[PDB]
Write an enzyme that holds these catalytic residues in place. Structure first.
Site, PDB file in Angstrom:
ATOM      1  N   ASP A  49     -23.638  81.099  40.634  1.00 17.12           N
ATOM      2  CA  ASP A  49     -24.091  82.123  41.570  1.00 17.12           C
ATOM      3  C   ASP A  49     -25.552  81.975  41.967  1.00 17.12           C
ATOM      4  O   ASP A  49     -25.914  82.268  43.103  1.00 17.12           O
ATOM      5  CB  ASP A  49     -23.862  83.529  41.009  1.00 17.12           C
ATOM      6  CG  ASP A  49     -22.397  83.961  41.060  1.00 17.12           C
ATOM      7  OD1 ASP A  49     -21.522  83.229  41.591  1.00 17.12           O
ATOM      8  OD2 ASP A  49     -22.135  85.087  40.574  1.00 17.12           O
ATOM      9  N   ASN A  94     -18.474  82.343  45.189  1.00 15.53           N
ATOM     10  CA  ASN A  94     -17.858  83.668  45.070  1.00 15.53           C
ATOM     11  C   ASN A  94     -18.935  84.580  44.518  1.00 15.53           C
ATOM     12  O   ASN A  94     -18.668  85.483  43.714  1.00 15.53           O
ATOM     13  CB  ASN A  94     -16.653  83.643  44.124  1.00 15.53           C
ATOM     14  CG  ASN A  94     -15.789  84.877  44.258  1.00 15.53           C
ATOM     15  OD1 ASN A  94     -15.966  85.672  45.182  1.00 15.53           O
ATOM     16  ND2 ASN A  94     -14.819  85.022  43.361  1.00 15.53           N
ATOM     17  N   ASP A 313     -18.781  95.528  34.423  1.00 12.81           N
ATOM     18  CA  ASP A 313     -18.663  94.131  33.984  1.00 12.81           C
ATOM     19  C   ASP A 313     -18.540  94.057  32.468  1.00 12.81           C
ATOM     20  O   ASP A 313     -17.560  93.503  31.944  1.00 12.81           O
ATOM     21  CB  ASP A 313     -19.863  93.296  34.457  1.00 12.81           C
ATOM     22  CG  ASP A 313     -19.883  93.069  35.969  1.00 12.81           C
ATOM     23  OD1 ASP A 313     -20.892  92.507  36.437  1.00 12.81           O
ATOM     24  OD2 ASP A 313     -18.927  93.438  36.682  1.00 12.81           O
ATOM     25  N   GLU A 341     -14.245  89.222  41.158  1.00 11.50           N
ATOM     26  CA  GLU A 341     -13.891  87.798  41.068  1.00 11.50           C
ATOM     27  C   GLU A 341     -12.387  87.556  41.190  1.00 11.50           C
ATOM     28  O   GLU A 341     -11.957  86.517  41.727  1.00 11.50           O
ATOM     29  CB  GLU A 341     -14.474  87.185  39.790  1.00 11.50           C
ATOM     30  CG  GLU A 341     -15.972  86.823  39.935  1.00 11.50           C
ATOM     31  CD  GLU A 341     -16.961  87.996  39.709  1.00 11.50           C
ATOM     32  OE1 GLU A 341     -16.627  89.198  39.922  1.00 11.50           O
ATOM     33  OE2 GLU A 341     -18.114  87.703  39.343  1.00 11.50           O
ATOM     34  N   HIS A 385     -15.041  83.831  35.458  1.00 12.78           N
ATOM     35  CA  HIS A 385     -15.843  83.632  34.258  1.00 12.78           C
ATOM     36  C   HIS A 385     -15.598  84.692  33.184  1.00 12.78           C
ATOM     37  O   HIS A 385     -15.461  84.348  31.998  1.00 12.78           O
ATOM     38  CB  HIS A 385     -17.347  83.603  34.627  1.00 12.78           C
ATOM     39  CG  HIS A 385     -17.822  84.808  35.390  1.00 12.78           C
ATOM     40  ND1 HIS A 385     -19.036  85.402  35.127  1.00 12.78           N
ATOM     41  CD2 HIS A 385     -17.282  85.499  36.422  1.00 12.78           C
ATOM     42  CE1 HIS A 385     -19.222  86.413  35.960  1.00 12.78           C
ATOM     43  NE2 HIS A 385     -18.170  86.493  36.756  1.00 12.78           N
ATOM     44  N   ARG A 386     -15.508  85.968  33.571  1.00  9.40           N
ATOM     45  CA  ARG A 386     -15.336  86.980  32.541  1.00  9.40           C
ATOM     46  C   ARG A 386     -13.973  87.011  31.865  1.00  9.40           C
ATOM     47  O   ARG A 386     -13.864  87.448  30.736  1.00  9.40           O
ATOM     48  CB  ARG A 386     -15.715  88.370  33.073  1.00  9.40           C
ATOM     49  CG  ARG A 386     -17.202  88.435  33.476  1.00  9.40           C
ATOM     50  CD  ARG A 386     -17.775  89.875  33.568  1.00  9.40           C
ATOM     51  NE  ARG A 386     -19.089  89.763  34.210  1.00  9.40           N
ATOM     52  CZ  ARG A 386     -20.177  89.239  33.659  1.00  9.40           C
ATOM     53  NH1 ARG A 386     -20.216  88.866  32.374  1.00  9.40           N
ATOM     54  NH2 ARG A 386     -21.281  89.152  34.401  1.00  9.40           N
ATOM     55  N   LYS A 411     -19.913  80.331  36.367  1.00 12.99           N
ATOM     56  CA  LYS A 411     -20.340  81.252  37.423  1.00 12.99           C
ATOM     57  C   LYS A 411     -21.626  81.984  36.995  1.00 12.99           C
ATOM     58  O   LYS A 411     -22.542  82.151  37.819  1.00 12.99           O
ATOM     59  CB  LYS A 411     -19.237  82.265  37.763  1.00 12.99           C
ATOM     60  CG  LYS A 411     -19.561  83.099  39.001  1.00 12.99           C
ATOM     61  CD  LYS A 411     -18.318  83.809  39.535  1.00 12.99           C
ATOM     62  CE  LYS A 411     -18.564  84.436  40.908  1.00 12.99           C
ATOM     63  NZ  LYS A 411     -19.420  85.683  40.875  1.00 12.99           N
TER      64      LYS A 411
HETATM   65  O1  LIG Z   1     -25.660  94.026  42.184  1.00  6.21           O
HETATM   66  C1  LIG Z   1     -25.311  93.392  41.180  1.00  6.21           C
HETATM   67  O2  LIG Z   1     -26.028  92.603  40.594  1.00  6.21           O
HETATM   68  C2  LIG Z   1     -23.903  93.588  40.671  1.00  6.21           C
HETATM   69  C3  LIG Z   1     -23.270  94.840  40.867  1.00  6.21           C
HETATM   70  C4  LIG Z   1     -21.843  95.070  40.404  1.00  6.21           C
HETATM   71  O3  LIG Z   1     -20.914  95.124  41.571  1.00  6.21           O
HETATM   72  P1  LIG Z   1     -20.269  96.502  42.170  1.00  6.21           P
HETATM   73  O4  LIG Z   1     -21.380  97.342  42.712  1.00  6.21           O
HETATM   74  O5  LIG Z   1     -19.357  96.071  43.268  1.00  6.21           O
HETATM   75  O6  LIG Z   1     -19.566  97.177  41.039  1.00  6.21           O
HETATM   76  C5  LIG Z   1     -21.379  94.032  39.367  1.00  6.21           C
HETATM   77  O7  LIG Z   1     -19.985  94.225  39.136  1.00  6.21           O
HETATM   78  C6  LIG Z   1     -21.705  92.626  39.873  1.00  6.21           C
HETATM   79  O8  LIG Z   1     -21.229  91.653  38.959  1.00  6.21           O
HETATM   80  C7  LIG Z   1     -23.233  92.520  39.995  1.00  6.21           C
END
Ligand SMILES: O=C(O)C1=C[C@@H](OP(=O)(O)O)[C@@H](O)[C@H](O)C1
EC number: 2.5.1.19
Length: 427
Positions: A49, A94, A313, A341, A385-386, A411
């Protein structure tokens, strides 16, 4: 296809120096690119990422250098909005943190850029963000399915009254917040209703302040932003260790420790996922806090029934840890697991049943009743990944587990299995 088989782990104990936070890394890189001056980021995460964000900045003309291990980055700020024409295509894998934030940032001024990514990314919603950007003046075209990437961005976001839906992803509001200060006119962002993943908004505001910009937060229902601002390099900036990546190791100790200490995050961290430690404590584990560490020591493990909207997460880690808990665990208010994901509610329920659990896949919750004993399963990982990291915990039992496509952990955590092995003990 590729796979990795984890043998049973008798006990976990040790210390892990965490990889950098993906959330902080991508925000810091974009802000450093927009800022005036040179920013030196340390403890930056090297993962897919972040690599996609770095590649995007390179394609947009930003100059930077990386250390040998890619965790130190010296960025030459552009001193203003980034630009490219010719429908330049930026491939973002992604990476939601890159897709959503760049979709907004690149609407400043004029541009002609296309944002795309892997097949699954073309199935992750972005309409709420596009709707908001358009209200502010941006010209955005859906090149394939309406409400999803890929997007052709032709600029025009000037500011004004912008409504944004915060019920599906906090990433849309995050994107708007980082972009608005650089727009010529003042912007008032009104949240339509509910706001999910609220702690991530706090991360965004924290990073913006570090880069010299503050806004008026009216109880998370409306954000007032002054236009005509400029981001400024904070000089040297230390990226926090990743609290989401830490969850697997702290959970491992709650299940099979031992004491596992993760460094790089502590009681003062801005990441909402440090609250995952609070959940382990509620389940029966012992937690210790330091300025630059969090540790977990095995106590006992009891099922919990909790709203996990604040830690979506790291919450996935509780779903496999639940296999080792006494009683039935229920994780609620996690609808957006479905648009990440992979559809994580479907995936988690499907794989958990393979190792013996009785699972109710609710529309926006998951209920898990552990089996008396786990059985061997070959776990599908859904390019997520998770899923790979969560199911690695199955090996903290009497049965091995085979994880398909183990490299999908790259990721956010390329070295995941070597790190789990570091704390894995035979005695
Ligand atoms: O802004 C960020 O760093 C993230 C916000 C979250 O998404 P959501 O707001 O869609 O829940 C999280 O799930 C993603 O892995 C990272």
């Amino acid at each position: 296809m590729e796979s990795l088989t984890l043998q049973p782990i008798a006990r976990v104990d040790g210390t892990i120096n965490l990889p950098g936070s993906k959330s902080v890394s991508n925000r810091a890189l974009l802000l450093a690119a927009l800022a005036h001056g040179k920013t030196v980021l340390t403890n930056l995460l090297d993962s897919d990422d972040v690599r996609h964000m770095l590649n995007a900045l390179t394609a947009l003309g930003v100059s930077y250098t990386l250390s040998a291990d890619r965790t130190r980055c010296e960025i030459i700020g552009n001193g203003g909005p980034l630009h490219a024409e010719g429908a330049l295509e930026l491939f973002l894998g992604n990476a939601g943190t890159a897709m959503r934030s760049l979709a907004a940032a690149l609407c400043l001024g004029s541009n002609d850029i296309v944002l795309t990514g892997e097949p699954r990314m073309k199935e992750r919603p972005i309409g709420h963000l596009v709707d908001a950007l358009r209200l502010g003046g941006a010209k955005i075209t859906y090149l394939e399915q309406e409400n999803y990437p890929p997007l052709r961005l032709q600029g025009g976001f000037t500011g004004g009254n912008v409504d944004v839906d915060g019920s599906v992803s906090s990433q849309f509001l995050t994107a708007l917040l980082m972009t608005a200060p650089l727009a010529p006119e003042d912007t008032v962002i009104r949240i339509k209703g509910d706001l999910v993943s609220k702690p991530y908004i706090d991360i965004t505001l924290n990073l913006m302040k570090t880069f010299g910009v503050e806004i008026e937060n009216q109880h998370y229902q409306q954000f007032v932003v002054k236009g005509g601002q400029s981001y400024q390099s904070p000089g040297t900036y230390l990226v926090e260790g990743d609290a989401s990546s830490a969850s697997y190791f702290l959970a491992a100790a709650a299940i099979k420790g031992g004491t596992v200490k993760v460094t790089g995050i502590g009681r003062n961290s801005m990441q909402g996922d440090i609250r995952f430690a609070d959940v382990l404590e509620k389940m029966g584990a012992t937690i210790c806090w330091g300025d630059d560490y969090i540790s977990c020591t095995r106590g006992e493990l009891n099922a919990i029934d909790m709203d996990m909207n604040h830690i979506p997460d790291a919450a996935m880690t509780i779903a496999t840890a639940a296999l080792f808990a006494k009683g039935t665990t229920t994780l609620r208010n996690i609808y957006n697991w479905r648009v990440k994901e992979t559809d994580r509610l479907f995936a988690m329920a499907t794989e958990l049943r393979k190792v013996g659990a009785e699972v109710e896949e609710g529309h926006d919750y998951i209920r898990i009743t552990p089996p008396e004993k786990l059985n061997f399963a070959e776990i599908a990982t859904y390019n997520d990944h998770r899923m790979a990291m969560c199911f690695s915990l199955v090996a903290l039992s009497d049965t091995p587990v085979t994880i398909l496509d183990p490299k999908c952990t790259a990721k956010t955590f390329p070295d995941y299995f070597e790190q789990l092995a570091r704390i894995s003990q035979a005695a």
